[PDB]
Amino acid sequence: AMNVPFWTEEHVRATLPERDAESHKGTYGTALLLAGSDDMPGAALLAGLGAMRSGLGKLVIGTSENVIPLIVPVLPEATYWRDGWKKAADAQLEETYRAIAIGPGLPQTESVQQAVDHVLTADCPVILDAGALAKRTYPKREGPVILTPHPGEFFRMTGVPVNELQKKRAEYAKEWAAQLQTVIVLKGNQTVIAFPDGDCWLNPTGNGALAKGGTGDTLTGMILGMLCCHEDPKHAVLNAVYLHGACAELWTDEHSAHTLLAHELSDILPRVWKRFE
Amino acid sequence: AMNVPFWTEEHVRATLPERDAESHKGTYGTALLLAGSDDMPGAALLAGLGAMRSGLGKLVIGTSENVIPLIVPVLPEATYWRDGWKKAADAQLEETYRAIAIGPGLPQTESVQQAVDHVLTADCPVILDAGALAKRTYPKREGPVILTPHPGEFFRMTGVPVNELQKKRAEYAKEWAAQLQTVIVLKGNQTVIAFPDGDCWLNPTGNGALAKGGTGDTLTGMILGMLCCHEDPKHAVLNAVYLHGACAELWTDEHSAHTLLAHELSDILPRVWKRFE
Amino acid sequence: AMNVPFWTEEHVRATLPERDAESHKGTYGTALLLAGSDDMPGAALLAGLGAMRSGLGKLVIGTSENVIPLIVPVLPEATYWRDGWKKAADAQLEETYRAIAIGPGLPQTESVQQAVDHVLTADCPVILDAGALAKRTYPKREGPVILTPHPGEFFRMTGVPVNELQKKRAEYAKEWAAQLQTVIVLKGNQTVIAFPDGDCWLNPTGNGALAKGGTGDTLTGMILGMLCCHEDPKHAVLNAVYLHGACAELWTDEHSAHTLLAHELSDILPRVWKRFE
């Protein structure tokens, strides 16, 4: 209705970064992932895998102490900030991170919002997902704030009912990205990527294989990693959403759309990303 | 002897659901799996994997607290109800589920039957397996109750000795499905799927690769997921049994029937299901 | 020197069992594996995987309590006897098993020999490996006792020094199998399988990829499973040793012999066994 353009293959190809011979892991930065609670532990593994697959140099996972042992055997490349999402409620971040994500597998509590307030004082891009998504405003800061709501979370954030939202997804996403001065990745078929400067795109990739628990956690991780290897954070977000969807399309070539598990998106990404190089 | 028809490839093809572009995980529902105990933990992983592979939107696993960490690294897409099968002995279910399964890896105790009585007060289809199978009757309710006994469990449920049962499997399955007003999936070579309205089918797929611990737990999970993505729960049961067997047949093309592990059925399902689309 | 015959492909093909359509897991029996200690936990996973891959119907692992959680995510098809190898020091076995193995990952202690004495009172074939191997004699019983020493363990058992043993491996293996009235699988290149009735064979398969920790634990498990699906326990032992070696040969077709991990033998077995059907 607003003729929002698709972020196409051509755009992805033109903007994906090189990983040059003369680089070291510092070139690609350290990401912080604040995710996973004793009650919802898997989200940290999913987002962790997505992040480390997506071109960062190092990952620190600030998860609950009891979640750490669940990640290690699957993602032994990650390091930890023990009870980090909880500690961030109380402490300013001491360390410098290339990018931060908070919220997958975290409860919708006031302490999580305290952590969010502290995350927002760093200079880097920050992603808020899942339990970090609330009805609130955001402080003026340097780096972008990227919100990743599904339609129900968008309702929690705005009071726009899901049935109204779905009739005018790009119009609402654009309006609220402007009002909040945040990026909004409004999930669903034809995910909307709305920027606070008024740019907006639709994602052309993906299918119903994604309509299952965990695929959003994987996407948050993918955005986090891509923020570390792209110079332009806008391109990071757009490429992450695109490639995430593309992985589901590769899956359905030889596998039923009913049968995908989110972690497999991460396993598919290496070959899918190669195709766009 | 009763000329029970086979649920054939043609029937599977005609009844498997589409996963359309405009869907979200809510379309495909949340399943509850009440399974796995400290003493028999693996059943929860097997049934969990089968369920999430089989087209549901979300899975909540109500397992023993000490089992949770064993599932997470393999199935990070699942969420949990801590000690859920035990809590269900005491509590009415508060939440609405698309479908429920109870029993894999659970002991044959009175408290498990208390949990079963509570599960039966929800409106959705319910599967009872393994330790949830007992000599008992069932209350009139909306959704179907699906019992998944092997011949020894059928003896526990009915007093029909296994040696007599095996001479007349479909006749006994049909008779007892009618008497109990439950679906009965009577396992074995040529698994019988008997409905309480008198419909009955045989399953034409599978082989002796299935004759090993865990393959029934996988099947319970597969039924659970398929109940979430099929509109007709009868077709869900029949397709789950069929596809489960078909996975074992794909296995034996290049692998010895002596060497299958149940979890691999779940790993095979994505490609097998595609073939029937 | 004694012209001991090789157990050849032809012999394997003629003796491997069918897994027929009309079977159930009971047909193929329940095995008990008494293995794995807090100090040497991996042996239980390796032997467990080998056993469940090798045609049994059910596996009960009697391992240390703290080892159980390490097995479940890899082998969720196994069930447990908590602290079973320790409990067997004190208790007669109550249950009937198709076959039993004891010793992988267990210490060389008197309590382990107490467990061995109790295992030997069951009627089934029994395998003794690793910490269960000691200088001792064996009581007259029905089923065979199968000892699986490497040359150093054979020295512990007999006082034959390794340097003398290695000059006359089949002569010593045959002599001691007769003296002890046990089967002796004397490991190494050209593994000797010596029976107490005087039959003896050499194994023609395998290579130096096997010369690394864990491959013997895998073999013990393979013998355990094959004892469950072969009518003739002699053929079970001989086929297990043969197929174990054959898996290492398949590996080295496209992978360096320096790089095999024991668990991969179990992963290779499905395709290797198919070739001999």
Place this chain on the structure above:
Amino acid sequence: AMNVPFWTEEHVRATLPERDAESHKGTYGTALLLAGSDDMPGAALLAGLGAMRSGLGKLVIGTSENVIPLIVPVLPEATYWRDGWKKAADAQLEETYRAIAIGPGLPQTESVQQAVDHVLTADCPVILDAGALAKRTYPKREGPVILTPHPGEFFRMTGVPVNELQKKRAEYAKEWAAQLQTVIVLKGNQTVIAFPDGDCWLNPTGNGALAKGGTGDTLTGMILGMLCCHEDPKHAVLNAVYLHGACAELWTDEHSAHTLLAHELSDILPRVWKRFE
């Protein structure tokens, strides 16, 4: 600038060892890996996998007690020295090892240096990495000491700033290998392998896929294993560095360089090593 030669394919082919038919795991020795702490557990899994993949006979991992359970399900072939890196601060090594590595995932503390002093009293080659790298000297002993610093660790060791180091990498590596009488593997694009007798080579393999956390831990493990199967420890180091890089090059044939996880290098090595045989 100093015309340092590359360690080429031809050199690798001429020096890689055979794994002969008549070998046993003792032929290839027992390695000790002192790695992994509660705070940095993954390094032990990465280095463990690299070591066991690289032609040793047995591996003992002296890791923190709470790390052990994280390794077992992935590497069940390893055995353990519980809290071994900590115990080595206090105890002379009692056992004889073919080679030792210390430091991946260990903190930069005085107690770790105490452990290093004890490790250095064994006769075998020893690798120091990560937290074991400090500004210090080394005692005259038989076997080589192999330091594996990245440029920041080289600064910690020498006071040569990273920006100066990077202009003259081979000159600084050679100078400091001579001064310390240690091997120095100075990591980065064109890794420098400097020997204390003045030999020095550059590594021609690898790419930016390696520029991510964990790949150095994998390399330490690879050196450790190769020290066990090569007669000449110089060739072990050079081949480990070469093959590690070659694995990343194989990866990038069909996968994006941004998406490699360190553990996959270990999974690739079997096929890559075969190519050089």
